[PDB]
Amino acid sequence: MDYHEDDKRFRREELCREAEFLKLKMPTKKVYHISETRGLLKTINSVLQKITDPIQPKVAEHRPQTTKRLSYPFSREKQHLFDLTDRDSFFDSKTRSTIVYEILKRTTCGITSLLANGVYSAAYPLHDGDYEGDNVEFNDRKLLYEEWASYGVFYKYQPIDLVRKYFGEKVGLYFAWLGAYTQMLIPASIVGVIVFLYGCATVDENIPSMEMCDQRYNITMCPLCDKTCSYWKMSSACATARASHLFDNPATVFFSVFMALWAATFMEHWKRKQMRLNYRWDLTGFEEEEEAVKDHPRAEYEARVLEKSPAYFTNLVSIIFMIAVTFAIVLGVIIYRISTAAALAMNSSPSVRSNIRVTVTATAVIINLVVIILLDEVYGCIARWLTKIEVPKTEKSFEERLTFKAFLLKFVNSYTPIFYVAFFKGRFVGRPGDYVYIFRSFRMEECAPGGCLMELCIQLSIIMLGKQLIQNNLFEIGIPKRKQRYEVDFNLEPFAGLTPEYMEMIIQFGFVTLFVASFPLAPLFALLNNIIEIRLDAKKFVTELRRPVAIRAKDIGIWYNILRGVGKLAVIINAFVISFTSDFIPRLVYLYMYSQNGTMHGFVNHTLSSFNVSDFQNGTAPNDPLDLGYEVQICRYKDYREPPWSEHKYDISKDFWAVLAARLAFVIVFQNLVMFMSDFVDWVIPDIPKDISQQIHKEKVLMVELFMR
Amino acid sequence: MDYHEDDKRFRREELCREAEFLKLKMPTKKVYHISETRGLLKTINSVLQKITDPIQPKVAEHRPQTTKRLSYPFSREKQHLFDLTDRDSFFDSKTRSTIVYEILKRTTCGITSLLANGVYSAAYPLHDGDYEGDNVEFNDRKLLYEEWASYGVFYKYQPIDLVRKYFGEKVGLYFAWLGAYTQMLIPASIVGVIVFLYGCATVDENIPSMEMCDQRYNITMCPLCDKTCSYWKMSSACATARASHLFDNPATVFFSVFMALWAATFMEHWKRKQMRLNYRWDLTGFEEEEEAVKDHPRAEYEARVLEKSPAYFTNLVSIIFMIAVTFAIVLGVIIYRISTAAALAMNSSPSVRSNIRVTVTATAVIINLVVIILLDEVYGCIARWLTKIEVPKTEKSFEERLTFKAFLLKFVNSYTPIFYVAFFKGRFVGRPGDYVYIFRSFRMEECAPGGCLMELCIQLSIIMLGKQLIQNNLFEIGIPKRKQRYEVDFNLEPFAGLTPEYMEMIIQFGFVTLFVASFPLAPLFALLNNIIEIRLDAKKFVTELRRPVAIRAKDIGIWYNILRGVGKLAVIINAFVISFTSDFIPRLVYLYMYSQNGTMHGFVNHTLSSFNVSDFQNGTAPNDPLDLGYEVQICRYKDYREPPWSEHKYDISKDFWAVLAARLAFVIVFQNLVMFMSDFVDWVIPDIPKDISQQIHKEKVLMVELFMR
Numbered sequence A, B: 001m002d003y004h005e006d007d008k009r010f011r012r013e014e015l016c017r018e019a020e021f022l023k024l025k026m027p028t029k030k031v032y033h034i035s036e037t038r039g040l041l042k043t044i045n046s047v048l049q050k051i052t053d054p055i056q057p058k059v060a061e062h063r064p065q066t067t068k069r070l071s072y073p074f075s076r077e078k079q080h081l082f083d084l085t086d087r088d089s090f091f092d093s094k095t096r097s098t099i100v101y102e103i104l105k106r107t108t109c110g111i112t113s114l115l116a117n118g119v120y121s122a123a124y125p126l127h128d129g130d131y132e133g134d135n136v137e138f139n140d141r142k143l144l145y146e147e148w149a150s151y152g153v154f155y156k157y158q159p160i161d162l163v164r165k166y167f168g169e170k171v172g173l174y175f176a177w178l179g180a181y182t183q184m185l186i187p188a189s190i191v192g193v194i195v196f197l198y199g200c201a202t203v204d205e206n207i208p209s210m211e212m213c214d215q216r217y218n219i220t221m222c223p224l225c226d227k228t229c230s231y232w233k234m235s236s237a238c239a240t241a242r243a244s245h246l247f248d249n250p251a252t253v254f255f256s257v258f259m260a261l262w263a264a265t266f267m268e269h270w271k272r273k274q275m276r277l278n279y280r281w282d283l284t285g286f287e288e289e290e291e292a293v294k295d296h297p298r299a300e301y302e303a304r305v306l307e308k309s310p311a312y313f314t315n316l317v318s319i320i321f322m323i324a325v326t327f328a329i330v331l332g333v334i335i336y337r338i339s340t341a342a343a344l345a346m347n348s349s350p351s352v353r354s355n356i357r358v359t360v361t362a363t364a365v366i367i368n369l370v371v372i373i374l375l376d377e378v379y380g381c382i383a384r385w386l387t388k389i390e391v392p393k394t395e396k397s398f399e400e401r402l403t404f405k406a407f408l409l410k411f412v413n414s415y416t417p418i419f420y421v422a423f424f425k426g427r428f429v430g431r432p433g434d435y436v437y438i439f440r441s442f443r444m445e446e447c448a449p450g451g452c453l454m455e456l457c458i459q460l461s462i463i464m465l466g467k468q469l470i471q472n473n474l475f476e477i478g479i480p481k482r483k484q485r486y487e488v489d490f491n492l493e494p495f496a497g498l499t500p501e502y503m504e505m506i507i508q509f510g511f512v513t514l515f516v517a518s519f520p521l522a523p524l525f526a527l528l529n530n531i532i533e534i535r536l537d538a539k540k541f542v543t544e545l546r547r548p549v550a551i552r553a554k555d556i557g558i559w560y561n562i563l564r565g566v567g568k569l570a571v572i573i574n575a576f577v578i579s580f581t582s583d584f585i586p587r588l589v590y591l592y593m594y595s596q597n598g599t600m601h602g603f604v605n606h607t608l609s610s611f612n613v614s615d616f617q618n619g620t621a622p623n624d625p626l627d628l629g630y631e632v633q634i635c636r637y638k639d640y641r642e643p644p645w646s647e648h649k650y651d652i653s654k655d656f657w658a659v660l661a662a663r664l665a666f667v668i669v670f671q672n673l674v675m676f677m678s679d680f681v682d683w684v685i686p687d688i689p690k691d692i693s694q695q696i697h698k699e700k701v702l703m704v705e706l707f708m709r
Helices: A016-023 A025-030 A053-060 A093-106 A111-117 A140-147 A160-167 A169-201 A208-213 A239-247 A252-280 A296-308 A313-340 A359-390 A395-422 A453-477 A485-490 A499-513 A522-544 A558-581 A585-593 A603-607 A654-684 A690-707 B016-023 B025-030 B053-060 B093-106 B111-117 B140-147 B160-167 B169-201 B208-213 B239-247 B252-280 B296-308 B313-340 B359-390 B395-422 B453-477 B485-490 B499-513 B522-544 B558-581 B585-593 B603-607 B654-684 B690-707
Strands: A007-011 A035-039 A046-050 A120-122 B007-011 B035-039 B046-050 B120-122
Touching: A007 A093, A007 A485, A016 A025, A046 A485, A053 A093, A093 A111, A093 A160, A111 A120, A140 A160, A140 A522, A160 A169, A169 A239, A169 A252, A169 A499, A169 A522, A208 A239, A208 A603, A239 A453, A252 A499, A252 A558, A252 A654, A252 A690, A313 A359, A313 A395, A359 A395, A359 A453, A395 A453, A395 A499, A395 A558, A453 A499, A453 A522, A499 A522, A499 A558, A558 A654, A585 A603, A585 A654, A654 B654, B007 B093, B007 B485, B016 B025, B046 B485, B053 B093, B093 B111, B093 B160, B111 B120, B140 B160, B140 B522, B160 B169, B169 B239, B169 B252, B169 B499, B169 B522, B208 B239, B208 B603, B239 B453, B252 B499, B252 B558, B252 B654, B252 B690, B313 B359, B313 B395, B359 B395, B359 B453, B395 B453, B395 B499, B395 B558, B453 B499, B453 B522, B499 B522, B499 B558, B558 B654, B585 B603, B585 B654
Parallel strands: none
Antiparallel strands: A007 A046, A007 A120, A035 A046, B007 B046, B007 B120, B035 B046
C-alpha cells in the first residue's frame, strides 16, 4: 500500500561525510518545486517524492506536448497543447514520472553522473499494484500481464496502445516494430515451405541424383585426403546428392527474387506504420538539440585544454577500429580452422573403422558456436571501452556511435564462418598433379563428398535455430555477472536499454535475407524463434524488470538505416550464392551447350575429369589401396580439365572458362534487375498514407475554425 | 515615362458582345481592392492597374513572408514577418507585382483560363526604364545589362542577388544552378586535357600501334564487304590505330573513376549551395497545397461525371507512353540505318577510285543529327498532347508530369545512335564461313577498319560540339513558329518557362558523364558550350523577353531527381563502355596469359584468326581480287577462332571464353566499387553546412530574446 507519489530515491546510509554532506544539498534545491517525504526501513533507507499541482502545469507548459481535448468530431477526440479537461486525476503515472524526471535533469550543482558518482545508488519510478497476486483492485499491470505477457495467449494481437500508455513511446515503438516483423514473416514462411515441398516432390524424377545413385558404373574418385583415405564409389555417398537437389532447386531462384522484393516491401510497410503511429501519439518533430547536459569527460578534458591555453586522435582510433575488424575476420576463420581440426586424421588409433564423418561436422559447428557466443561479450566490452576512449560530445552521440561499433563486430564474428563455408571452401585447392599446401606442410581442405552445400545448410540451420537455446543454457553456468513498495522494486533488475535487444533481431534478419539462396525454409525458423521471443520479452518487461523512465522518442532512428543497409547488401550476396555455390549454372550450361539430345543426361560424366593415378608426388598416394575393384588405373575429380591421353594434360580446359563466363554473366543480370525491382517497389508504394494526410488536414481545419471563436 | 504602377492588361477592342460584356465584370471586382486606370493609343487599347497602400500590407500579411528588420547584429540585417521599416517606398516592384498577381489569382467568376479563353490577350508586369539607351537615370535593368548580360564580361562572377531581386527566386535559382555546374566543370576539364595529353605523349612508344603501322608483314584481311571490296593491308589503315591509342589509354580508366566521383561531389556541392541560398532568401517550407485553383478540364469532366450520377485509363495511356518509347528507340535505329545507307556500294558508277570512306561517316552523322533535331519538336508536341489527354489534377502536377514525359523522349532519341554505335555495331556478324544477313538478302554491317571507336568519338564530338549551332542556324529557315511603356513591352516575346532551358543542360550533362570512358576531353567541350550559353541566356532574359511574374519556389524540384538518376546510371554504362567497346581487356589478358616474355609483343598476331579464302558461299567472294600480292591464299579477321589446319575449324575458340570471362569480371568489380565510392562521398560530405546551422540558431536566439521585451 502507498499514497500517490512519482519517483523514488535510494541513498546509502553509513569520503562518506562528503556523501552525506552533499547528499542533502540536492533536496534543498528540491524544496523549491516538489513535495518530498522520506522513510526508514530494514537495511538501507530511501527517499520519496510527490508532485503537487500548481507547479505541474508549469512544467507541462514548459514544453509543448499534446493532451486529449474537450470536443470530438467524428467519433474520436482530438489533441492540443494544454486545456479543457480539469480533473486533477488525468495525468498518467507515466506522464507524472516524465515531468518529475525533467525536473530531476534540469537542476544540478546532473543527477546522472551524481548517481554514477556514488552518493546515490538508484533512482527509479515505481509501478501501481502488482502483477497477478491475490485480490488486487484491477491493476493496469495485472491487465497487461493477463492479456499480453502470458504464453497462453500468443496468437492474439499486440495491445500496443496500453503498452505505450504504461511503458512509454520507446518500448511500445520496439514492440510495434517487432510485431510488424513477425507479421510480415507469415507469407515468407508459407512460400518458403511451398518451395521446400516442391523440392520434395521432384526428387525421384530428376537426372543428376539418379546418375549419382546409380549402380553398375564402378566409377572411382581421387582420395580427397593426404594419407589416410582411399578411393570411393559415387553411389556410396548419395544422400548428400538427394538433399542437394532438395536445396538447389530451380524454384529456389524464384524464391530468392521473392525474398529481396519481400525485404523491400517490409521496409515500406514499416515506414507507413510508424507514420500512422506518429500520428496517433506525437508529430511535432522540433525536438531541442543541446537541451540535455553534455557527457562529463568532455567537460573534464575541456578543463584540461582550458588549462592548456583534438580532431585527429578520433581518426587514429577509427583506424584502430578497422584493425579490430580485420583481426575479428581472420580470428573468426582461425576459430573455424580449429573447429574443423577438432578431430582430424584420427583413423590410425582405434582401428574400428566407423569413419562416418557426419557428426564430426556437427561437433565442429557446435564447438564453433560456443566460441562465437563466448567471444561476443568480449567484442561488446572492447566496443564500450574504445568508444569510451573516443570521448564523444553528448549522450545521444555516445549511444549512436557505440551502437554502430557494436554492430560491426557482431556482424563480422557472426557471419564469417558462413562466408568461409559458402565461398572459399573448396575453390583454392589444385589438381591431383599438385596440391595446395597451407603452412607449407599439409593440404588445405577438400570439399564435402558431392558438394559443399550440406555443411552450409546444417551449419546455418542450427545457428539460426539453436543460438538462443545454447546462449540461455550455457550463459548461467558461466557466472556472466505486507512488504513495502520501493523495497519490492529495489530487488528487481535495473534497466539497460534496447540495444542488446534490437541487436539479435537485426542479426536474425540477416540470416533471413542473406542466405535464402541456397537454403529456403529460413523464415520458418525465424518465425518459430520469434513467437517465443516476443512473449518472453513481454514477461521480462513485466516480471523481472523495474519500470523505465519513458523518454519520448519518435522513431527507432539508426536501426532503420542498418536494416536498409543489410536489405540492400542482400542482393549481391544472393547473386554470388546462387551463381557460385549453388551449382545451378553448370546445369544450365550443360543443358544448352553439351546436350547431344533435348534434355540432360550424363551430367556427372560431363563434370568429372579422369586423373591418372601413377602421377602422385612420391607420398601423396593412398596409403593402403582398398581394392574394392580388382585394380584401379584412373580416378576422377570434378574440376573441368582435359583427360591425360590428349597431348596437353591437366591444364585449364575450355569448359572452365565457359562456365566461369556464364556464372559472372548471371551475377551481372541478377544484381542489376533485382536492384531495379527493389528500387521500384520503393518508388511505387507511398511512404505517406492517405488517411493520416487528410485526417491531420481535417483536424487542422476543425482546430483552427473551432479555435478562432 | 510613366507613374508608379504594377501590372498591365491587354484587352482586344472590336461572340464579341459577350467579350466586352464579361470584360467589364472583372474590373468591377477590382474596384474593391486596387486602383485601376486605363488609356487609349494606336492600334488596340490596354488597361492599367496601380496599388494603393492600405490594402497592400493586408495582402502582405495575408501570407507569411520575410522582410528586412530594423535591428542588425554582427554587420548583417535580419528578417521577420512584417514590421519596422515604414517608408512606403521599400516594396520592390517584384514584390508589388507579386502581391498584385496574388489578388489577380484569388478572385474569380480564374484569370488564367479567362486569358486563354479569348477575352484578354496578355497580362504582364512592366519593367522600370530601359536597357542601354541614352541618358537613363540609373536603371536597375541597365545595371544588370552592364554587369551580367554582356559578352565582354563573362569571366566575372554571377551577380546572383540582384537577379533574384529583379526577376524572382526561380530564375535566379536557375542561373545559380547553372553557375554551379559551369564552376564545377573547371577541374573536370583540366584533368580531361591532362589525360588527353598523356595520351599524346605515349603514342610512339607503345606495342600495338607499331605492330599495325609496321611494313614487311604482307598480312591481308578478309574483304569486309559483300561484293565490291578487296583485300587490304594492315599498314594501310593505321591512322585509326594511332587515334585509337589516343582514346583507349590506360589512364582513361582512371579518368572514368574520377568522373563518377566528380558527378557525386557535384550533387553534394549543389545541395549545400541551395541550402545556403534558401537561408538567404526564404526557409519556411510550409507552402500551401490545394491553394491554387485546379486545372479546368478536370472541372469539366467533373461536371460530366457529376451528370452521370476513371483511374484505369491513365494506366492505359501509360502503356501507350511505353509503346511510344519503344518505337522511339527502333525508329531511332532505323534513322541511323538510313543515315549509314546515305551512300552505300556506289563504287560501280564513277570508276574514279577515291574510296576514302571517311567523309561518308561525317555525312551520316550530320544528316542523322538534322533528323534528330527535326524529330525533337514532334516528340515534344506528342508529349504535350498525351499529357493533355491524361487530364491531371492541378497546374503543378501537369508541369511535373509533362516534364517527365518530355525527358524520356529526348533521352531516347538523343542517345540511341550512340548506344547503337558503342555496343551493337560489329558484334552480331558471323565468321567468314557464314555471314549474318538482315532482311535475308544482304549483310548487316562490318566494323570500322581497326576498331569501332572512331565512329563513336567523331559522332559524339560533333553532337556535343555542334548541336547548338546546327539548331540555331537551321531552326530559322524552317518557319518553326517617345513610345509608351506597355506599347514597348507588348511587342516583346512572351515567357514560356524553363523546361526547354533546363532540358538541354540535363542532356549535355548526360553527354559528359555517360561517355567519358571511351572519349575524354568531353567536359572541355561542355565548358566551351556553357560559357557562351549562360551569357546568351542572360541577354535573352534582358533584351528579347518581357518580365516574368516571379512565383517564389524554394528548389528546382524534379530536376534534382533526374540528375541523381543520370549520375547513378553513369556507372554501369561506363563499365560496359570500358570493358566491351574500349578494347582494354584483351590487352590485359594478353599481358597476363599469352605473354611468352615479360611484356606484350605480337598482340595483333594474337588477335587475328586466319580464314581460308576457298570457302565462300558461291558469290560472297571478292568480285575482282586486287592482287596487291602475286596471289592470296589466306585472309585474317579479328574474332578469336582456331586456324583451319586443326581438326576443328572455324568454331568458337578457347580464347573467346577466356576474354569474355575477363570482361564480365571487370564489369562486376567496377560497378560495385564505384557504387560504393559514389555512396561514400554522399555519406561523408555534410548536406547541411555549419555556418547556416549556427547562424539560423543565433538568429533565432537573438530574435526571441530581442522579441520578449
